Structures are given as structure tokens and as C-alpha cells.
Design a protein around this nucleic acid. Sequence first.
DNA 1: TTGACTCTCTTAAGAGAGTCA
DNA 2: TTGACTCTCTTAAGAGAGTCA
Lengths: 162, 162
Amino acid sequence: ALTNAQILAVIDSWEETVGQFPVITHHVPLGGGLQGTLHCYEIPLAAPYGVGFAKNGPTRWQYKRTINQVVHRWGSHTVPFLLEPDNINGKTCTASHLCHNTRCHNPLHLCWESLDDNKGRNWCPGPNGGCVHAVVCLRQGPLYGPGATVAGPQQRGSHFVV
Amino acid sequence: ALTNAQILAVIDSWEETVGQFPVITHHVPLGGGLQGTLHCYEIPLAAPYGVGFAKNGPTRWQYKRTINQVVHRWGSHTVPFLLEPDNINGKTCTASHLCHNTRCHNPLHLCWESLDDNKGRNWCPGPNGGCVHAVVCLRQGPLYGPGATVAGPQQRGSHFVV
DNA sequence: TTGACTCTCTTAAGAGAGTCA
DNA sequence: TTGACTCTCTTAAGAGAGTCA
Ligand SMILES: [Mn+2]
Ligand SMILES: [Mn+2]
Ligand SMILES: [Zn+2]
Ligand SMILES: [Zn+2]
Ligand SMILES: [Zn+2]
Ligand SMILES: [Zn+2]
């Protein structure tokens, strides 16, 4: 099995490579009518992506290193968390974008949490709009707002009460 | 079926049958430390479910009627909305449970909206905790809260900024 | 050992359609 | 005509593994 020192070396080579990705400045809603700035380190749109990186889906990538003649591979956003527990409350831990930008691999924009926690950040009002996430959001979720509901609760007769 | 009269007849037959489902009282968090009461009309756990109803999945049902000698079938929660547009902004409209109770078929607990709007209600703070849904939530979402994040954003070196 | 492709899978909110009696 | 089963599919946040040179 890979030693802790070997895992730290994978994390270090991953950081070295991702740190050379293009850095894109984005202005983002924080909630409460305030605006902030995030700096995303974005994997390229097409090959080559960077040393060790390859695309396995439209917005999916993997990181690969060969150690002592054995090929090891990880989801490209999971590498910062290789020294962390991989489940919690019986749920698998997932890499969760606080910047809501899939191509971004900035580890300061990622956290490690259940898929439900991950998804729920899409609707959070944001760090200045009432976020209650213990690991605080970096921005208001892209789907926060009144929604676009087509039809509300209704009945034709009188068979029901709320 | 095709005619407005035929569609109204489907909605009315559905309301009459669902109106005879057992009414189960559920006390729910509203947000803001307050609690409310919802009355769900719950489809039975096993056959028979009611005239026109059949189970196609662990928590999926369909409603079926024979019109003009032809069988017409719908998802069991979609029937209240048969006269509404079936898409919005190019996204499919879905039946969305405000009571977060799949077995419930109370149309006063249903709305008609995109799958994203639907999902997002799971994390809403609720009608007394800051819900901004234009079609208002009936309760705080079951997944609202601080979360259980295992690891937050972090780096080993000095290559990244927020 | 490495790059650039290929495939299918998970989850939890939702769907459509066929086989028998 | 009605009932009671069977199967796979959609979406958008996420995954693992194979082939070839
Ligand atoms: Mn996410
Ligand atoms: Mn729902
Ligand atoms: Zn980012
Ligand atoms: Zn938040
Ligand atoms: Zn209900
Ligand atoms: Zn709401």
C-alpha cells in the first residue's frame, strides 16, 4: 500500500501541476446584495490537460501516478483529500466545489462531504446571505432564488385540506 | 385524453379516489423554531392502492384510465397538472412534494416545477425561516442544516489563493 | 510510465412503457 | 376494462476501470 509519505508526494505533485493551470478571476454573488471575487484554477478544455491528467467524461477527469511499477488513479478533485476519512454517517465522501465551477481544481475551492451536502450548496443564500454550513460557502449558490414554479398547489373539488 | 372535458374528468376521478386515501397527520419544522401540521393523503403500502392506481417502483406509482377504448397512463402525482405546460425554460416540469412525503398524493401538497427547483426545496430553511420560493414551501427542507463536512478547503504548499 | 481516448456506475429527486391475468 | 406486477430511463451533483502504443 502507498505510505503516508508517498500519498503526500502525490498530493504535492498534484498541487504543483494544478497551480500552473490558467487562473481565472470571477466576480460572484455572496448573498445580501454583496459581490466578491474567486480565483479558479481551470483545467484546459481539451488535451493536453497537464502532467498526470486525463478526461474520462465531458466534465470528469482523473489523476494517475505510477509508483513502484503500480498504476494508481484517482478522481481529479479527490486528491487533496487522500489523507482524510472517505465516508461519514455511512455516506461516501465527495469532492464538492465551493466555486460551483467543475473545471476548477483549486483546492482552496473544494471540500469533502456527502453527496447530499454537496448538492445542497447549489441553493445556499451565501456567506453574506445566511449560510449555515459549518464549512462556510464561498458564494451564493447558482440556483438560489424564488424559482420558476409553473403551477402551485390546487384542487378542483373540496376533497382535501392542507 | 385529448379533450379538456376528458382531462377535467380524469382530474376529478383522481381527486375522488385520492380523497379516500388515509389522512395521516405529520408535524413538521417550519423554520424559526416553529412547528406546523400537514395532513397527507397517503397511498397504501401494498395492493390494492385504489381505482386506477398501480405501483411501478418502490416509491413510484401510475394512474390509468380507459378513454375512447384506449388506455391512457400518467405518473400518479402528475394528474393535477394535466392542463399546465409540460416544460419551462426548456426544462421538463415535475411534480414536486412540498410535504417531502412520496406516498402523499394530496394536491394541496404538490407543485409543478423544474427538477432543479424541486430538488432545491430539500434544503430550504422553510416558511418561517426565510424561504424565498415564490410558490412558498410548506415546511423546512429535511436536509437543511450545517452539514457534516469531513474536510474543508486546504493546501500543502503556497501555489493557491481563494 | 505516460497520454488520450473508451466504457459503465452512484444518488435521490423525478419519469415512460411492457407482461400477464 | 381493471389490477398487479415487470423493466429501464432522466437529471446534475458526483465516481471506478479498460485499451493501446
Ligand atoms: Mn457541488
Ligand atoms: Mn421533491
Ligand atoms: Zn474555483
Ligand atoms: Zn452555505
Ligand atoms: Zn403530503
Ligand atoms: Zn422554500
